[PDB]
Amino acid sequence: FPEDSTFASELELYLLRTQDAEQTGMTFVHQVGSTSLPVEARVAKVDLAKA
């Protein structure tokens, strides 16, 4: 590693991570003369960290 200069006294790092939900979950099965059914709930999430 080479050398570097900063003119400060502390250095901090922040990281932000995202996680979407996948488009999965095949399909519900039907019979022709009836009504539909609802689809389940998914989840997405984010975290963040510091050093």
Partner 1 sequence: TWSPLAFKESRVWDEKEILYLGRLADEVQAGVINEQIAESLTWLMARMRNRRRWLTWQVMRTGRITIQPNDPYNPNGLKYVIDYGVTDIELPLPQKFDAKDGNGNSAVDPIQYFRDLIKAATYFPDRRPVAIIVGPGFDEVLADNTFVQKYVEYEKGWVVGQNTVQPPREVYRQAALDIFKRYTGLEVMVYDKTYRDQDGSVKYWIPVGELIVLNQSTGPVGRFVYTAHVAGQRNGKVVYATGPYLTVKDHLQDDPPYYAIIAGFHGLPQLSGYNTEDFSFHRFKWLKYANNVQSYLPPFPPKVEL
Partner 2 sequence: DKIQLFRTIGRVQYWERVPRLHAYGVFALPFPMDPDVEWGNWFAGPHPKAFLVSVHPSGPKAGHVYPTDLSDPDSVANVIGMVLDGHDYEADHNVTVTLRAAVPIEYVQQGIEAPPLQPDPAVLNAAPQLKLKVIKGHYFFDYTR
Partner 3 sequence: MRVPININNALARVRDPLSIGGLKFPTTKEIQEAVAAIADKFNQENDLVDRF
Binding site for partner 3 (CB under 8 A): 6, 8-22, 42-46, 48
Q: How far apart are CA 43 and CA 21, in angstroms?
A: 6
Give the x/- contact pattern for partner 2 in 1-40, rule: CB under 8 A: ------------x-x-------------------xxxxxx
Residues present in the chain in total: 51
- The end-to-end CA distance of the chain, in Å, is 20
Side-chain half-sphere CA neighbours of 15 within 13 A:
4
The smaller minimum CB distance to partner 1, of residues 8 and 26, is found at 26
The smaller minimum CB distance to partner 1, of residues 8 and 16, is found at 16
* CB 33 to partner 3: min, Å: 31
